[PDB]
Design an enzyme around this catalytic site. Structure first.
Site, PDB file in Angstrom:
ATOM      1  N   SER A  59      -4.590 -32.419  29.343  1.00  0.00           N
ATOM      2  CA  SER A  59      -4.056 -33.650  28.791  1.00  0.00           C
ATOM      3  C   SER A  59      -2.606 -33.529  28.288  1.00  0.00           C
ATOM      4  O   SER A  59      -2.009 -34.529  27.934  1.00  0.00           O
ATOM      5  CB  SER A  59      -4.932 -34.147  27.690  1.00  0.00           C
ATOM      6  N   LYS A  62      -0.262 -35.763  29.925  1.00  0.00           N
ATOM      7  CA  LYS A  62      -0.080 -37.114  29.494  1.00  0.00           C
ATOM      8  C   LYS A  62       1.335 -37.327  28.929  1.00  0.00           C
ATOM      9  O   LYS A  62       1.866 -38.458  28.992  1.00  0.00           O
ATOM     10  CB  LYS A  62      -1.148 -37.486  28.467  1.00  0.00           C
TER      11      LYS A  62
HETATM   12  O1  LIG Z   1     -10.041 -34.915  30.709  1.00  0.00           O
HETATM   13  C1  LIG Z   1      -9.493 -33.824  30.551  1.00  0.00           C
HETATM   14  C2  LIG Z   1      -9.507 -32.766  31.628  1.00  0.00           C
HETATM   15  C3  LIG Z   1     -10.924 -32.309  31.759  1.00  0.00           C
HETATM   16  C4  LIG Z   1     -11.575 -31.358  30.981  1.00  0.00           C
HETATM   17  C5  LIG Z   1     -12.975 -31.425  31.190  1.00  0.00           C
HETATM   18  C6  LIG Z   1     -13.323 -32.264  32.192  1.00  0.00           C
HETATM   19  S1  LIG Z   1     -11.970 -33.039  32.880  1.00  0.00           S
HETATM   20  N1  LIG Z   1      -8.897 -33.468  29.413  1.00  0.00           N
HETATM   21  C7  LIG Z   1      -8.625 -34.407  28.343  1.00  0.00           C
HETATM   22  C8  LIG Z   1      -9.897 -34.841  27.587  1.00  0.00           C
HETATM   23  N2  LIG Z   1     -11.021 -33.913  27.745  1.00  0.00           N
HETATM   24  C9  LIG Z   1     -11.208 -32.695  27.212  1.00  0.00           C
HETATM   25  C10 LIG Z   1     -12.418 -32.279  27.695  1.00  0.00           C
HETATM   26  C11 LIG Z   1     -13.213 -31.046  27.497  1.00  0.00           C
HETATM   27  O2  LIG Z   1     -12.606 -30.016  27.227  1.00  0.00           O
HETATM   28  O3  LIG Z   1     -14.434 -31.141  27.616  1.00  0.00           O
HETATM   29  N3  LIG Z   1     -12.918 -33.265  28.493  1.00  0.00           N
HETATM   30  N4  LIG Z   1     -12.064 -34.265  28.524  1.00  0.00           N
HETATM   31  B1  LIG Z   1      -7.658 -33.697  27.363  1.00  0.00           B
HETATM   32  O4  LIG Z   1      -7.454 -34.290  26.161  1.00  0.00           O
HETATM   33  O5  LIG Z   1      -7.087 -32.519  27.725  1.00  0.00           O
END
Ligand SMILES: O=C(Cc1cccs1)N[C@@H](Cn1cc(C(=O)O)nn1)B(O)O
Ligand SMILES: [Zn+2]
Ligand SMILES: [Zn+2]
Ligand SMILES: [Zn+2]
Ligand SMILES: [Zn+2]
Ligand SMILES: [Zn+2]
Ligand SMILES: [Zn+2]
Ligand SMILES: [Zn+2]
Ligand SMILES: [Zn+2]
Ligand SMILES: [Zn+2]
Ligand SMILES: [Zn+2]
Ligand SMILES: [Zn+2]
Length: 349
Positions: A59, A62
């Protein structure tokens, strides 16, 4: 390096506690980059981490997508108060007739979820998803941190500039920012510098393409490239449109507790307490809908995770200090925040 003791003291305990295979740390102070590299990018090869190793930053992507959006604004291709449907014919007729680009960017459109439902795995299904989505909250009233929200923002900003997102990033924006080893699609010649992520069962893993992955969480970059981005966010860049773009990403839109939401970057009054920094990076703020409140020396940060990867960036323009921390373990965000906070306090003096 006389910063090495201070960085090692904060970083080595993380490596041991979370069995982190490798971490690249880069620190900015007084115009000068310092690189501190620990462990391995790849447990099969035993290849060492350097400031050239590529990590998935999740993220933190972003912040780069947000900068592209700001660049589209600066170039006059769009405005933050444009309705989303102005930049997507296929949203005409939907609630996105009455949600703005800024609202997408700042996750405030009305309760778009953190992730697309698992079933949304194609262009066609994604368009249908957005066309059938029912707002949970009035536009602007709640922050629900959301990949579909900022992902759409990035996707439509690119569309506003009449170029594919991956191309705009790799051919125009990232080289413009001094980031020549920053990729959405890692090319053949850079694959040898590409770390593997390590799951909790120590399996080697990398990101899979999902819908709007590129825009929401798809960047691979090095500590050196990400610190040049930090440098650009403090000392600026040569190109004037880019400079103005970066500035736009610094402005506060609204606040949740002591965190202020901008385009990509999340900001705090500096000096910032560990408690304040943890709260704004808390599970509550990340996972739940929180009401927006009027916005706020300033610290800017962003966390990022993927399967097997954990990243963090924070910087303080007024003091010329910044830190990048890229690991190939998804280790807990509180640990990232505390280590960054202690290292930056030492740099600030
Ligand atoms: O969406 C992503 C990338 C992915 C990580 C896991 C599946 S897709 N990251 C954003 C939110 N997230 C963090 C997490 C996590 O760590 O579980 N799952 N979702 B992030 O804030 O880096
Ligand atoms: Zn040491
Ligand atoms: Zn499209
Ligand atoms: Zn290049
Ligand atoms: Zn090069
Ligand atoms: Zn580079
Ligand atoms: Zn791709
Ligand atoms: Zn498990
Ligand atoms: Zn600024
Ligand atoms: Zn706004
Ligand atoms: Zn509420
Ligand atoms: Zn002092």
């Amino acid at each position: 390096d006389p910063l090495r003791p201070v960085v090692d003291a904060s970083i080595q305990p993380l490596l041991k506690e979370h069995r982190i295979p490798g971490m690249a740390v880069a620190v900015l102070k007084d115009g000068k980059a310092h690189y501190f590299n620990y462990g391995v990018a790849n447990r099969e090869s035993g290849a060492s981490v350097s400031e050239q190793t590529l990590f998935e930053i999740g993220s933190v992507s972003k912040t780069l997508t947000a900068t592209l959006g700001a660049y589209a604004v600066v170039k006059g291709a769009m405005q933050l108060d444009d309705k989303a449907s102005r930049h997507a014919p296929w949203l005409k007729g939907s609630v996105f007739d009455s949600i703005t680009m800024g609202e997408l960017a700042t996750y405030s459109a009305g309760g778009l979820p953190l992730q697309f439902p698992e079933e949304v795995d194609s262009s066609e299904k994604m368009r249908a998803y957005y066309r059938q989505w029912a707002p949970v909250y009035s536009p602007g009233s709640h922050r629900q941190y959301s990949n579909p929200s900022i992902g759409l923002f990035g996707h439509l900003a690119a569309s506003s500039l009449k170029q594919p997102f991956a191309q705009l990033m790799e051919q125009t924006l990232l080289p413009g920012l001094g980031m020549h080893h920053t990729y959405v699609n890692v090319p053949k010649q850079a694959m040898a510098s590409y770390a593997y992520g390590y799951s909790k069962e120590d399996k080697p893993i990398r990101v899979n393409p999902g819908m709007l992955a590129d825009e929401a969480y798809g960047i691979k970059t090095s500590s050196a490239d990400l610190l040049a981005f930090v440098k650009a966010n403090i000392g600026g860049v040569d190109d004037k449109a880019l400079q103005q773009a970066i500035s736009l990403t610094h402005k506060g839109h609204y606040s949740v507790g002591g965190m202020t939401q901008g385009l990509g970057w999340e900001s705090y009054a500096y000096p910032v307490t560990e408690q304040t920094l943890l709260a704004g990076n808390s599970a509550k703020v990340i996972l739940e809908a929180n009401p927006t409140a009027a916005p706020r020396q300033v610290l800017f940060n962003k966390t990022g995770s993927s399967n097997g990867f954990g990243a963090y960036v924070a910087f303080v323009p007024a003091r010329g200090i910044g830190i990048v921390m890229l690991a190939n373990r998804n280790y807990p965000i509180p640990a990232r925040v505390k280590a960054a906070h202690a290292i930056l306090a030492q740099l600030a003096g």
